[PDB]
């Protein structure tokens, strides 16, 4: 009636679970969970990206004490130098020849790369967003729609109002502080905007890439030009964004737990490959098939006629069904112990009818819950040739 | 060419700036490289010369060459120009004071034309990099392997996507700026600019002004040789101070923003995704540092870091729901569990 | 016998036939270029001394 | 500069080709390099351009340079070549 299911989240590949119904005959309920994501409520703390010491023209005052005044920026790095005096075609820009003081100023301003294919910080609160789930069933075939995976009322789509998780598969492979960057997404601690560090991540901390404000502890040190003429060297410590290809904070699309892989995303971890999701469903009693409309199928025997061990659904097994009525019969292994791909297998009195499956067990000692009659479809299957391809459809996963 | 961003382009004057390594490890020249941008993951660098090649003051051609000899242009053919890094570049486009050029990687930038009273070239150190988008570590990508989504700068011009403040250019040395008005030292404009002129002697020195002028103190070294631009803008530099008082707004885009393109890109010679029972053995044959890493698809994270630039069968114990394997910034593999052994029967006489 | 002796195995000098398990691996000539890059294991006349 | 073995020269035309690497953004050069024979223990290199320099289609001189512009030759001097 209410379809409990330990039933992981794998790619999208079709894989089944089974509604053990007791008042009426069991009906399958393929819970194929395509993905899950988390999307906690968030706040953009600062974009990061490799710096550019893009000088916004020096405030100089070669007369007496040189001044540094920021113009549409919070800070300006400015360092006085003497022993140099400006010549660039002769004359001087300096306006005292009684004080030969030279104010070199250079501030960091966001790179153009900050806009695009960039690190982007977040303070990540509490998950609130759905999980995409296919449900095929033995009274409706397929629907692949998003239904909540956390408490705020899961939607009813198909013959199944289905409560997923909470947050099982993509629990949140994110940390509190998260940077997300193209390929490698980093669940990595760093301090909020205003106090960052050059060698650590968040050397540049601009509130937005476009915005003309940041905090630039990039360890920008101007050096004294020589030979009696001005220039402005930028000496800067290794970037907190060139790390992401060298130093690692955890490159989450290559180190994620929960089977999920990651991209530039608003704190989603798409396309999981584990979940062991405890999905619990309210399927109406009507959607079930009766234990009179479908026989009690007992006095059956199942034997493989060519099982396939793999997530490959070429596994078959005749079952010499013995009906006490006779009719249709939705089937699936009890909530994954193998994945069965025949929605319904026909049952007649003393007949035999093959169904299709794929083994989620090494050998097919999987029960097949033939609408009030379990049966082991024992034998042996095709080679395990495969273990280099996607995320399985051999639900019951913990070894398959 | 395009005048759809005559904001920078038209309203750009040749800018003069000191060279720090030249002909005595110092010379006077217009050129002097600020804002070298090897920040793309590609092969192309956006550069600012101080000199404003591009047009002249008109609208036509990025293939002219206007540098400063004097405070005046020298608007000639771009054929005496040599942009180079540590080796000759191939120009992509110039717009404003900014040139985009596909350059080999290089520690320095080396520009030069003999059109001055001297060698008149300029060199400076400025950091250029290209590297893989995530994973892998390379400098400049190989000529072989996969192409994949790098940052790279445009093949075109007159763009926008980011903007750096270019709010008031000002004072630079050049005594053509500070000529003499037959007694007193006289500010001049590039092509028209609002010059907030003054000298050490008391005067107004703030305001949006070409009402600030001081003649009271006389000498080119006691006065502010300016081109306070606001309609002849140049990109702001360390060798381009601004007037001490308020900015004249002039935030201006970059028309050479990083866009996606197919770079010749990074992927060291082919991997082999091998498998045995609950294990990805991975025979690998790279010629370059490829960040291999894997992720056991269970609720285990299984991080990995290992540079593979050595041909190696490595192993990652695939958990019971598969592993994924991320062979550099070349596309992710994914692998289910169950076991294999590469097509080994596990039993097969049917029941 | 790739990456050792007999990576190249010619039975005639100035060969027109041989047996070459040299570990010859072609790679992609990226960006619409027509060329053949050859990635090959070192030989019995590149080391083994 | 003279041409005697018309085995290669006459019974050939320069064949257009594309340079393997010529910066990030390649230049198309019909003098694309295959078969480097620099494995001399001296320092001297023989190179194969895809271009058939030599003759134009005439009888004399390796002093010309016939590379491909179009499907057609471009038979000019060889002295603009610089191996380095």
UniProtKB/Swiss-Prot annotation, chain C:
Subcellular location as annotated: Virion membrane; Host cell membrane
Top-level taxonomic group: Viruses
UniProt topology in membrane: Single-pass type I membrane protein
UniProt PTM: N-glycosylated.
Subunit structure as annotated in this protein's UniProt entry: The precursor of protein E3/E2 and E1 form a heterodimer shortly after synthesis. Processing of the precursor of protein E3/E2 into E2 and E3 results in a heterodimer of the spike glycoproteins E2 and E1. Spike at virion surface are constituted of three E2-E1 heterodimers. After target cell attachment and endocytosis, E1 change conformation to form homotrimers. Interacts with 6K protein.
Protein's job: Class II viral fusion protein. Fusion activity is inactive as long as E1 is bound to E2 in mature virion. After virus attachment to target cell and endocytosis, acidification of the endosome would induce dissociation of E1/E2 heterodimer and concomitant trimerization of the E1 subunits. This E1 trimer is fusion active, and promotes release of viral nucleocapsid in cytoplasm after endosome and viral membrane fusion. Efficient fusion requires the presence of cholesterol and sphingolipid in the target membrane.
Protein name, per record: Spike glycoprotein E1
Species in which this protein is naturally found: Eastern equine encephalitis virus (strain Florida 91-469) (EEEV)
Taxonomy of the source species: Viruses, Riboviria, Orthornavirae, Kitrinoviricota, Alsuviricetes
